[PDB]
Amino acid sequence: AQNPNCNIMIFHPTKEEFNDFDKYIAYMESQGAHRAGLAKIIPPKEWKARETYDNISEILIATPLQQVASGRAGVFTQYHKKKKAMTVGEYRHLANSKKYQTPPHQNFEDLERKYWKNRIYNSPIYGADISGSLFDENTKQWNLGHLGTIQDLLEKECGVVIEGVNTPYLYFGMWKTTFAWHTEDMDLYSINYLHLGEPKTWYVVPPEHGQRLERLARELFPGSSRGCGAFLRHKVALISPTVLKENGIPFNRITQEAGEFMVTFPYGYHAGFNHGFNCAEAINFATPRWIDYGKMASQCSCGEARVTFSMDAFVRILQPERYDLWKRGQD
Ligand SMILES: O=C(O)CNC(=O)C(=O)O
Ligand SMILES: [Mg+2]
Ligand code: NI
Ligand SMILES: [Zn+2]
């Protein structure tokens, strides 16, 4: 079995290997990359996502989210308070202000220590989940707006044609902006490209051990667990590496820098934080190997998780028994 310790693997495809996206994902899996839940892909030196980032400041962040924490430094939830719209140029200036800027630090490890010590005492503002793309239309390789769609994959594998669309999302971050522990909708893959700016630190639990994380989360967030049998779908709970190590939960960590891709694999729980002002683009995707994970994915039916239009068909076809209850949670 390849990668039996479930380490995060880093890949350096050549420009020739960068042509066929599906083939390269299957290659990484042949080497055991999925066992970690997360892999890093460094693009060939010849590749670029676009020519420059000099003209992005007029993108609108219609609903910036202030991420307010509750709990203790290693075990907390966050809720998102909606703020007034602002442009990317306004948000960049805000991120670089004295109130929100990255503190002085020695290295990524020092900054990670400062994040876990101090995150709860601040409320950073995240420009998350903005439909759109920063890939140039002429970029033909690993262009996250030109991937094969999940609907087309389901149709190729299963023969059933379904409604729905699959487009990318932009994330504008600042110091301490946080992504809570989650797997993707329907336990899909994700791919994330860090277009510019400061790094993003990731934590990940191997898919084979995801239920260990879930059991810890039920213990640590007991009211949330009574409310919902899949409350991590709410995407609000944080657990630090120190707490994970104290409870014996297997995980790994890695820092993504600008110009790098990350892939999360089906049922790979992940969480993390941004180091300073940055912009990332991410999208969900599927492969043949996903189908079995989609059929087994948990679902939130309490009403909290509320998701896209396109998840309807995935539930309806892959999980017909759950469909009626889940749809009630959507309505
Ligand atoms: O970058 C973020 O805030 C969160 N991204 C992801 O969870 C992802 O790409 O799957
Ligand atoms: Mg602009
Ligand atoms: Ni994710
Ligand atoms: Zn729920």
CA gap 127, 61 in Å, rounded: 6
99 is in an annotated binding site: no
Strands 9-11 and 38-41: parallel
Q: Which residues contact 114 (CB under 8 A, 6 or more apart)?
A: 103, 105
Q: Residue 128's closest CA among 183, 192, 223, 215?
A: 192
Tell me if 72 sits within 8 A of 221, measured CB to CB: no
Q: Residue 69's closest CA among 82, 61, 56, 78?
A: 78
Q: How many CA atoms lie within 13 A of 250 on its CB side?
A: 17
Which domains, from first to last, does the chain contain? 1-331 (2.60.120.650)
Give the relative orientation of helices 311-318 and 150-158 as an angle to the nearest 10 degrees: 20
Q: Residue 101's closest CA among 206, 197, 18, 222?
A: 197
Resolution in A: 1.4
Technique used by the depositors: X-ray
Q: Which of 177, 178, 179, 261 to mutate to test the pocket of ligand 1 (most atoms within 8 A of CB)?
A: 179
Kindly provide the b/e burial profile for residues 170-201, where b requires at least 16 CB atoms within 10 angstroms of the residue's own CB: bbbbbbbbbbbbbbbbbbbbbbbbbbbbbbbb
Question: For 267, left (φ over 0), alpha (ψ -120 to 50), or beta?
Answer: left
Q: Map 50-94 to HEC letters.
A: CCCCCCCCCCEECCCEEEEEEEECCEEEEEEEECCCEEHHHHHHH
Q: Residue 172's closest CA among 120, 134, 209?
A: 134
235 is in an annotated binding site: yes
CA gap 263, 143 in Å, rounded: 14
Strands 86-87 and 178-182: unpaired
Question: Encoding tokens for residue 115?
Answer: 């994040």
Whose alpha carbon is nearest atom 3 of ligand 1?
179
Question: Encoding tokens for residue 188?
Answer: 């899909």
For residue 314 and ligand 1, the question of a CB distance below 6 A is answered with no
Strands 169-173 and 125-131: antiparallel
CA gap 315, 146 in Å, rounded: 24
Q: State the DSSP code for 142.
A: S
Tell me if 232 sits within 8 A of 248, measured CB to CB: no
CA gap 47, 30 in Å, rounded: 24
Q: Which residues contact 207 (CB under 8 A, 6 or more apart)?
A: 34, 35, 37, 265, 266, 267, 268
DSSP states of 144-184 as a string?
Answer: TTSSPPHHHHHHHHH----------EEEEE-TT-EEEEEPP
Q: Which ligand is closest in space to the CA of residue 90?
A: 2
DSSP-based three-state secondary structure for 93: helix
112 is in an annotated binding site: no
Tell me if 125 sits within 8 A of 65, measured CB to CB: yes
What is the CA(237)–ligand 3 centre distance, in A? 13
Q: Which helix (H) or strand (E) holds 324?
A: helix 320-330
Q: State the DSSP code for 229.
A: T
Question: For 71, left (φ over 0), alpha (ψ -120 to 50), or beta?
Answer: left
CA gap 125, 147 in Å, rounded: 30
What is the CA(180)–ligand 1 centre distance, in A? 9
Q: Radius of gyration over alpha carbons of the chain, in Å?
A: 19
DSSP-based three-state secondary structure for 251: coil
Tell me if 40 sits within 8 A of 10, measured CB to CB: yes
Question: Encoding tokens for residue 43?
Answer: 């693009």
For residue 91 and ligand 1, the question of a CB distance below 6 A is answered with no
Q: Which residues contact 171 (CB under 8 A, 6 or more apart)?
A: 126, 127, 128, 129, 130, 278, 279, 280, 281, 282
